[PDB]
């Protein structure tokens, strides 16, 4: 199998119009879990989570998230006091781990205030990088608690990876499947003076795809226009790459997807 990841986000909003607090988990690109201050319930966002986790998992994470919602509200208020900030600001957390293709693992923990990097954890040095002087205040309090640092390292390296592996199995039929891209090249007079070659891929899962244009099969082209990997709405994805050319060199589109390389010459 390829790289997989498990990520959990927290968003807090002071004086919403919007919920005060939302939490969502993701395995790769797939929402698996949700919770907000309005439902006050942890719910599955994937059928294969609903079907493999007994009610007591949802009931127990419901209670933990009610806790995290309260801690986040208090923490946010504190950050706005530290800043002399009034009215609405956002506190954000992201925790997660990757199980890479080579079996090696990563872990990350970071916070954002109003969508900016506030605090980033290094689980190797057991330390928080602070962007400013209020960050550097929280850095201190946090780095004074060795039990918390070590708990976090252990969470990211052992628990997170064990959860990710648990959820990978539950969702294998979705997460470890391949829908190979359908790729078409066409040549279009797009506008007056402009003739272009489009290499368009769609129907693909997973979303990670590399598309480029080659000249005489040697040189990668420098002037390529790229279409974002975009969700099609059916659980598959679509993307393109295009180059402009002299109406009269052999150009080739190269697509790499899920361990398969594909060449289309015009």
């Amino acid at each position, epitope marked *: 199998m390829r790289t997989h990841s498990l990520r959990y986000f927290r968003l807090g909003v002071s004086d919403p119009i919007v919920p005060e607090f939302i939490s969502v988990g993701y395995v790769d690109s797939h929402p698996i879990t949700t919770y907000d201050s309005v439902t006050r319930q942890k719910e599955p966002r994937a059928p294969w989570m609903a079907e493999n986790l007994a009610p007591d998992h949802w009931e127990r994470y419901t*209670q933990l998230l*009610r*806790g995290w919602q*309260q801690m986040f509200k208090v923490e946010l208020k504190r950050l706005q006091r530290h800043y002399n900030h009034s009215g609405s600001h956002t506190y954000q957390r992201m925790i997660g781990c990757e199980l890479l293709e080579d079996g090696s693992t990563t872990g990350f923990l970071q916070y954002a205030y109003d969508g900016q990097d506030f605090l980033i954890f290094n689980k190797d040095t057991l330390s928080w990088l602070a962007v400013d002087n209020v960050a550097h205040t929280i850095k201190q309090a946090w780095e004074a608690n060795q*039990h918390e640092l070590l*708990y976090q*390292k252990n969470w990211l390296e052992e*628990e997170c990876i064990a959860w990710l592996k648990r959820f990978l199995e539950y969702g294998k039929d979705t997460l470890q499947r391949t829908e190979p891209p359908l790729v078409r090249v066409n040549r279009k007079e797009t506008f007056p003076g402009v003739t272009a070659l489009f290499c368009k891929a769609h129907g693909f899962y997973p979303p990670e795809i590399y598309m480029t244009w080659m000249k005489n099969g040697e040189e990668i082209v420098q002037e390529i226009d790229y279409g974002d990997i975009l969700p099609s709405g059916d659980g598959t994805y679509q993307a393109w790459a295009s180059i402009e050319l002299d109406p009269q060199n052999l150009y080739s589109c190269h697509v790499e997807h899920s361990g398969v390389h594909m060449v289309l010459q015009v």
Partner: antibody
Amino acid sequence: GQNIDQPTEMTATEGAIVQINCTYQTSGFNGLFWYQQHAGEAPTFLSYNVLDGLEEKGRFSSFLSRSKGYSYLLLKELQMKDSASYLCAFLDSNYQLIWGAGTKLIIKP
Amino acid sequence: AGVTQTPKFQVLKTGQSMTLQCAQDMNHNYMYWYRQDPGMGLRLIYYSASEGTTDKGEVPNGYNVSRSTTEDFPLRLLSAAPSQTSVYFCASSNREYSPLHFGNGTRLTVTE
């Protein structure tokens, strides 16, 4: 998040050393605690281990092997005041706190 | 600071109701109620992850709780039974994984 075993009772001489073993079986782990409870009083926190190894705090040390499902609380230069029950507890993957039945430590003068 | 648990001692008749009170001034989110019985580990009756929520522990039957505030976590005995003769400990913790701070206990005896 299943099982935890410690000795019911240990007896050692004042001035000497005791090692209180705690063995645990779990699928999921967020750390192992030692608490001290004197006769007729509330438990108080002694130690936390989550990574493999030895943490020293004065006369008291707490060891964890995560792979062997194994912790010990080591008490040096035993005093009469160390007489008390020692409670081993661990957190499972869901932060359930599973408590040992406790070990009663009897110090002989 | 710490955990203030009352009463320290209590005798009840079979069938009588009571409330053990428990207050902490530490801003802790987590409060717990345990019973301690000879030869077994602490058994959780109910817990509260924060103000506005509560959930059952391992031995909730015959008890109830409220957590309308951060500070207080009261334990209600519905109908005193002799099986409820025990020492009750209130506890708080900053977080689900942080150390517990305990109250000084309630020694409770229920007689017919």
